[PDB]
Each structure stands twice: as C-alpha cells, then as structure tokens.
Symmetry: none
Subunit: 329 residues, 2 copies
C-alpha cells in the first residue's frame, strides 16, 4: 500500500498550482478507483466525465491512463522510463456529455472544476496570443467570480483596486502579454470600463459568460488529432473528437467538422503497433452497419492509445456503461 | 435505506422464474441507479436499452418506471395501494437500436438477456396458440442452446432423450398445448426429426435462428398502443413504436406501419391529465420541422405515462444523452 499525489481542479483558498489530493491505494486498485475517491470527496454527480492524465514534466510525453488499468501496474511501468519526480498526475474532465455546460450547471462541483481546468489551459496556452479585447473580458469575468463584492462602479474607487494589483498580482487574471505592453493606468481605465458590462453578474452567470466568450477562439469542447484514415489509399486528415460531432475530420475550413461516425455506432475499439519499419500507432473502430472497419494511423502508439481512450470514454458515456469497448488484437 | 427485489433475465443454473437480484438503495437512488447496480455485475454494454417495469400481481395494472424517478418515492406510492408481496419489479429490455440483433451480438450478455426475455414472453403468451411446427423448432433451438456439449446424433438414442423427460422436464422447452395433444412416443419421433436441422449451430447461431423463426408470428421488436391523434378532430388509431418504424400508426394492413416521425426529430415530450370527460392522458411531442405538435390522447394517464417512457427511452438511446426529453408544464 503506497500513496499517490494527483493534481486536480477543485478550488480551495490556496494557489491554483498546489491544488491536489494524496490518495493511498493497493495492487488491485485501478484508475477508476482513484478517480471515484477524489471526486466523491467533493460530492460530484458526473463521475463518468473524469479521467487521469499522466504527463512527463521534462518533455511533451503524455499518457491518458485508462479507467480499467491498475494503478500499481501503471506506476511500475512509467517509473521505468523516468524517475517519480519527473511525473505529474492530474485529474481532468475529458469526456463531455452531450450539452455538457447545461448539464454541468446542475452539478456545481463539476461546473467549477471544468471552469478551473479550462481557464488554466487558457492561461498556459492561448492567453498571450489572443485579441486583447478577449483577454480583457475573460480576466474581468474571473475577478467578478471570486470577488462578488466589487459590484457596478466599485472598482473605479482606488482603495479596492490596489488589493488586486501591487501585492498579490494582476497576473492571476490577465496574460503577461497584456500587463506589460500597455501602461500602468491605461490598463485600469480599460479594466474598469470593461468590468462594467459584467459587473451585475453572479458567479455562475460569469462562468457561463467566460465559456461563451472563449469558445470562438479556443475550442475546449473537443480534441483534434493529426492522423490518417484508410486501409488501402491512406489519406491524412485532422480528426475532431467531441460531444457534438462524434468522430469527425476537419476540412481545412476551421475546426468546423465533417461527420464520420456517432459514438452510438462504435461497437469495438482496437489499437496496436504498426507492423512495419516505422513506429506508428494503429487504431481500428468496428462501426455498426458499416462493412469496413474505420482504420486510423497515428504518428505513434502513444497517440493511438490516447485516442482509443478518448473514444472509449464517449462510448461508455453515451451507452450507460462502466464496461470498456476496447479489445486485444 | 431499504432493499428491493428486481426480477431479471441474466441466466444462472437455478430455476428460470427465480432469476433475480436484491439491490440495496437509499432515498437518493433513482431507477437509473437500480438498473446500473443490477447490470454492472454482468459487464453489460448497452445499458441504455434497459428499463424497469412494475406489475401488480392481482390485476392487469402495469407501470414503467422512468430512469429519473427516485426509487423510494416510487415505492412509497405504490405500497400505499397494495402490500409489497403484490408487486413485481422486473428489469426488461425496452428500447431497441436499429439493427438491434446485430448490435447485441457484440455485447453477448445483452443478447442473452434479450433472448431469455423474448423466450419467456413467448411461453407465457403465445406458445400454446402457435403452429406446432413453430413450437417444435423453437423448443428444439433452446435445447441446442442449453446443452452445448450435446452434438447432432445424440438425441436419436433412447437413453438420453429420457434424461430430458424424467429429470429436467419437457415443459421447459415446449408448450403444454403440444406435450398433451401428441403421444409420448409420436412426440419424440417429432423432436428428434426436427432437431437435426439445427445440429451444427453454436449458442449464438441458436439464439439468432430462434429470433428468425419467431419474428413472423410475434412482434417483439415493437409496442402498439390504442389511442387517438390530433388536437381538434381527434382520430383514433393504433400507434406502433419501435426501432424500425419510429413512431407509426397502423392502417388496417396488419402490423404494417405508416411513418409519422423518427425519434431523432423528437424535440420535447409533455404529458398531462385530460381536463375533459374521462381520466384520459394527454401526450404532446414537439417535432423538428413541423410547427404543430403531435397530440396523442390515451385512455388513461397510466398509458400516457407508459408511452412517454417508451418514446423518451428511444430519444435518449438515439441521441446520446442521459438528459430526458420530458418537460414538466
């Protein structure tokens, strides 16, 4: 019996980068058990949406650990390639229900977890590069969510503004790209003016306004994979996997998808090693009412495996099961 | 926190009318929760196909319990009217996908569950009234399925045929209608003669040929309801609801249906009491691309409620949600 530190996105009054839970487990404990123990602690309704992402701290290596995998078997395997201080385990929401935001507002621990997760990704990945009107609104909205006391024109008084700027930092709400490039108090005639259009909202209306604003410049509701379809004339595409498109491919005309299969039609999921000279990842989906299986060639076995995990998650969610649709050969 | 006895169709080597599960539930458990607790044990994939039927033993009263209803609230209501020993709760497959047989072969616990359920209904409802050629093959196919070690030339020998007479029982495979009207040894010239055409079939092929033969004389892939359509000039019809017709009404020509809507078109379901002469149940479906709702007028609220459950089950199955399409005004 050992213990495991899982970073997660359930908020407390500490600093975001320290949010975590230490879970102790046996050699029969699987990843599903780890997940239920952490969220049940927070009275989460939508347990089936959560998964466990293992990232290598010193590269781009990432493994989504399947709910059926044993934690000890997993911890034993990945500690061979790298030392324990080189791995980060985080709980993320990965499998979204159809109409997830509406369904998440009806389960507020998860609505917030998702909000935290999406905001965090937003900062670490696209906050610096985004239209600075957007970066403003999103920032204002998070201030409005934590500090429900700064109503209407209350940030225009200076003795509350400095509670947010000089000591703690504005970098908690705004990208560094924007806090540097504009002047010390041209920034706050912009913030106080921007704040006014959201000053009336409670926190839940703020969380939802956050998503409305962010979605058109950052699709957090899907995952895309560069890969190739076919068993004879292999064509390379960008697959889009998500709640409202099922399995789709991008047709160069934005993230707007062309449909391929519904999760309800996927009967079996299968992923192997590429039988030849390169180390590509293979993926086969048996689709109902379709003679040919859907064959996917991914750049690596790691990526094939991560994709199988995403598709199995939606399959489980869309039927009402805990049983995996993945098989062996 | 109480216990509940749910009859079902997962086979064990006990006696068939005694197959059941005792599930423990609290006062937050919904029907969906009961169903999950029963099926997860058997690695069932298509959980969204299952529903829960409550029948009163001392009348013809039947209530389909909606997955969102809470078990204890339901159970309190019907235990007011009659004591527990007069109620039977059975898990049933009620919502079928298009190409359901094909879909079930890739989830054999359900294929087996469905077979048992359909075979049971057959014996309890129409086995006695069906052409005795049909009764012969159907009875035989269960034998070829039940004893998977016994090959084709094994029933022609007299000393194992009576292993099925004296110990197991012939009433287990054939209607009493047939075991009585033909004599003991004209009947085995009949069983042995019929059995030979199915001797190569394994268990999966036995089940599928069972459905193949049964389907033309007993529709187990649909439900029919006597009711009336329209909001003004009410016409009385027989609705036929199922995977291969969606919502249809019958028009004189057998169970041969006229199409009305596909489940994918159903936007909202709404069912209330008739403010009119009888305690009729009203049922309104908003259909996409039709300005006018489809109004269904049923003989009682109970039938209206049972129809709402069927249509909602299919709406959930066909889209991929747990979210109900039933709205409550």
């Amino acid at each position: 019996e050992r213990v495991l530190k899982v970073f997660h996105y359930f908020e407390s009054n500490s600093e975001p980068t320290t949010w975590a839970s230490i879970i102790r487990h046996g050699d029969a404990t699987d990843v599903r058990g780890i997940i239920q123990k952490i969220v049940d602690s927070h009275k989460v309704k939508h347990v089936a949406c959560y998964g466990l992402r293992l990232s290598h701290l010193r590269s781009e290596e990432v493994h989504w650990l399947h709910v059926d995998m044993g934690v000890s078997s997993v911890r034993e395997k990945y500690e061979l390639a790298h030392p324990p201080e080189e791995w980060k385990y985080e709980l993320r929401i990965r499998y979204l229900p159809k109409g997830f935001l509406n369904q998440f507002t009806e389960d507020k621990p998860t609505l917030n977890f998702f909000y935290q997760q999406v905001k965090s990704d937003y900062m670490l990945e696209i906050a610096d590069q985004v239209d600075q009107e957007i970066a403003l609104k999103l920032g204002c909205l998070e201030i409005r969510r934590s500090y429900g006391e700064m109503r209407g024109n209350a940030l225009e008084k200076k003795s509350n503004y400095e509670v947010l700027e000089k000591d703690v930092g504005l970098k908690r709400f705004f990208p560094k790209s924007l806090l540097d490039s504009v002047k010390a108090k041209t920034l706050r005639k912009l913030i106080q003016q921007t704040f006014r259009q959201f000053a009336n909202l409670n926190r839940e209306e703020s969380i939802l306004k956050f998503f409305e604003i962010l979605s058109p410049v950052y699709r957090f509701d899907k995952e895309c994979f560069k890969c190739a379809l076919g068993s004879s004339w292999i064509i390379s595409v960008e697959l889009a996997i998500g709640p409202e498109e099922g399995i789709s491919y991008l047709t160069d005309k934005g993230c707007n998808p062309t449909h391929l299969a519904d999760f309800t039609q996927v009967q079996t999921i299968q992923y192997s090693n590429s039988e030849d000279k390169d180390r590509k990842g293979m993926l086969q989906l048996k689709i109902a009412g379709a003679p040919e299986p859907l064959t996917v060639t991914a750049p690596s076995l790691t990526i094939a495996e991560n994709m199988a995990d995403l598709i199995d998650g939606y399959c489980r969610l869309v039927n009402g099961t805990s049983q995996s649709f993945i098989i062996r050969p």
